[PDB]
Design an enzyme around this catalytic site. Structure first.
Site, mmCIF file in Angstrom:
data_model
loop_
_atom_site.group_PDB
_atom_site.id
_atom_site.type_symbol
_atom_site.label_atom_id
_atom_site.label_comp_id
_atom_site.label_asym_id
_atom_site.label_seq_id
_atom_site.Cartn_x
_atom_site.Cartn_y
_atom_site.Cartn_z
ATOM 1 N N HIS A 110 1.565 -18.280 12.623
ATOM 2 C CA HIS A 110 2.275 -18.102 13.864
ATOM 3 C C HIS A 110 3.544 -17.293 13.664
ATOM 4 O O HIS A 110 4.329 -17.534 12.734
ATOM 5 C CB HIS A 110 2.538 -19.456 14.536
ATOM 6 N N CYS A 130 2.736 -16.939 20.665
ATOM 7 C CA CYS A 130 3.957 -17.073 19.859
ATOM 8 C C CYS A 130 4.625 -15.721 19.648
ATOM 9 O O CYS A 130 5.840 -15.581 19.870
ATOM 10 C CB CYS A 130 3.665 -17.742 18.494
ATOM 11 N N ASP A 136 11.381 -20.976 16.900
ATOM 12 C CA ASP A 136 9.968 -21.354 16.848
ATOM 13 C C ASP A 136 9.411 -21.630 18.264
ATOM 14 O O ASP A 136 9.877 -22.538 18.960
ATOM 15 C CB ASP A 136 9.794 -22.586 15.943
#
Ligand SMILES: [Ba+2]
Ligand SMILES: [Ba+2]
Ligand SMILES: [Ba+2]
Ligand SMILES: [Ba+2]
Lengths: 377, 377
Positions: B130, B208, B151
């Site tokens: 990711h 992401c 994140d």
């Protein structure tokens, strides 16, 4: 080079194929519980190894069948743009073709070589790789050998079809470069090259892998004798009858729930053996479930609940493997977690393993090996 | 090393990110049509290059901002199993950390270093990668520097959360190995290490990449001054307000419809320039649409219809680029194909390009450059 094929839980057929998975699936060929089982033939007497493949004498025939172990390196790239050159075949694949040619240069018995491989466009950025199957059949008395490709993605319908003219501007497949590689592999102009053909079947538009595996089965069995039977006519009515759901859960349960060494496989197709499921596998499966579940990424049961359950089950399973025994208290703790370990995916895992351990339930499985005394907590 | 970033038609944000795409997106930073535009700062006077990154003087500040060009090699692997060692950082990433440390050892002005990178589990077989973002901010007068990770996958909710105890058995991220790499990158024990923090935002469970890009914008702008503003409180109410749909179509249209050299980009962020869309790009886009459409794989308009349309449009577009001109007959042929070229995806492509060519339609775009005479067919 990595030597184990771990259980991939949460893997499903729509999630696609690769060389290692496919090879793992090979183990099903001798398991009689499986719909992929070949009781259509036996192994080749230990001679004629033809490196890279597994040999088979036909039980019903004088026909020999060599199925290749899959390779990350059996790949054909093709240029979709037709002003470009047709493509490339990977020097290993080419190598294996040359080796078939050489096996056939001395062969007294009819043979069929089955090679799975990946076919991909290299112009475009997607680089969809689709699992696909080559077979080459050689006749000694006919002095000749015939290439065929079995392609699952063989959908396209008239609206999405390609005109004779536009075919000229666009390649949809690797047939050009592949046929080239083959007539290159034999030239003493020693062999007559049978016509190159391509078998497509219904409407895929990444399940290709699993169809490829099914086709390997069909290709082997159908070689004991009989015409080649695949979906779009000249075969099964629908794709669903061809690759049945019993074929699917077989494949999925194999990939999803088992831990298999490559040695275990090699032995298994060399000696015509079945690989029963060790308990160690149950433990590994649980552990992998465990790792994956704890993840955040790509009275109902929570993550920490599920994890404590797996922890405990794992623990007990080990103490069983450990010579040793289970304790009363431990059995109780498991009983409290039983309804949780039977839930959803984890359940499916557990049911797979209980089924292949000869146990009706967790309690039944775990009930011997327990030491009791008097009244225990 | 490949030097062009082709249009990937049929690419969408849910289809995930990579170093090249991300770098391509960088081009938006100076385009005022774009919601990613930084009129918050200018470039660094041509000095202090700090290789691997693009420098920025703050228009509103004495603060300097170095954003790294992304690398296939900036990667952190972590072991989900916590009996295992925390992981590895890729020797290039580590290298860049050491280089930041060294840039800061002599620095008279406050700085912020923005490095995008990929975070992945290496135990499990999925290997979800990711896209994720590191920033390091250094103060000379405070003799210290603070790491932070942004994140996007920062979902997890109490049911799917992890207990303090189970955290001990399981790593969900690369923070351990990463913090390690950082306190390794500085030791003369020259710097005080500000506390390592990690900013997660809403409920992703592969978008992401795009969030990461948006965050880079937020991180840069917010450094002219102001606290860092991301979704889960301390910022935007929802993910949808944060990464707006106008942010999304900007990103998608960029990736989907443009053909950009890396040189074009490097120039563009060195000189604070916008890259207008050449007509050559329209042609390349059409060609790629063309290649992909002809594919069979992963009065309504058919494949051969769509293709003939693209062929003709391409042809005309070239004759325009060719010095030269269009002919009456050609204009007619285009008019017949107009309703087809405006259809669906192809339409979206064409509308993108017409919008950025300063033309209301195909006919308007093509109408000059046509030679007429008398009555023509
Ligand atoms: Ba070659
Ligand atoms: Ba011929
Ligand atoms: Ba390292
Ligand atoms: Ba410390």
């Amino acid at each position: 080079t990595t030597s184990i094929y771990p259980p991939e839980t949460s893997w499903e057929v729509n999630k696609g194929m690769n060389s290692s998975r496919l090879h793992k699936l090979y183990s099903l060929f001798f398991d009689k519980s499986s719909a992929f089982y070949l009781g259509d033939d036996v192994s080749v007497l230990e001679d004629k190894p033809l490196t890279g493949a597994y040999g088979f004498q036909s039980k019903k025939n004088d026909q020999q069948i060599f199925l290749f172990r899959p390779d990350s390196d059996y790949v054909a790239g093709y240029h979709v743009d037709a002003k470009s050159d047709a493509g490339w075949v990977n020097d290993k694949l080419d190598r294996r073709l040359s080796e078939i040619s050489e096996f056939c240069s001395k062969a007294t018995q009819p043979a069929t070589f089955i090679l799975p491989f990946v076919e991909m466009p290299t112009d475009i950025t997607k680089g969809v790789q689709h699992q696909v199957l080559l077979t080459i059949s050689y006749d000694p008395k006919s002095k000749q050998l015939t290439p065929t490709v079995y392609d699952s993605i063989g959908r396209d319908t008239y609206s999405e079809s390609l005109s004779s003219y536009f075919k000229g501007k666009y390649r949809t497949t690797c047939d050009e470069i592949l046929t080239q590689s083959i007539e290159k592999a034999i030239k003493s102009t020693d062999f007559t090259l049978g016509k190159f053909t391509r078998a497509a079947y219904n409407h895929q538009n990444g399940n290709c892998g699993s169809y490829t595996f099914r086709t390997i089965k069909e290709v082997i069995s159908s070689s004991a004798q009989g015409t080649e039977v695949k979906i779009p006519g000249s075969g099964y009515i629908t794709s669903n009858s061809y690759l049945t759901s019993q074929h699917v859960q077989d494949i999925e349960s194999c990939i999803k729930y088992r831990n298999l060494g490559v040695v275990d496989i090699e032995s298994a197709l060399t000696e015509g053996k079945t690989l029963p499921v060790q308990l160690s596998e149950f433990i590994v499966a649980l552990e992998d479930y465990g790792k994956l579940r704890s993840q955040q990424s790509e009275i109902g049961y929570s993550k920490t609940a599920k994890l404590t359950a797996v922890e405990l089950l794992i623990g007990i399973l080990n103490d069983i493997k450990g010579k040793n025994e289970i304790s009363e208290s431990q059995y109780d703790k498991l009983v409290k977690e039983v309804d949780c370990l039977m839930d959803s995916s984890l359940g499916k895992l557990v049911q797979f393993h209980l089924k292949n351990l000869g146990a009706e339930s967790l309690q039944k499985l775990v009930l011997p090996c327990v030491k009791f005394d008097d009244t225990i907590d």
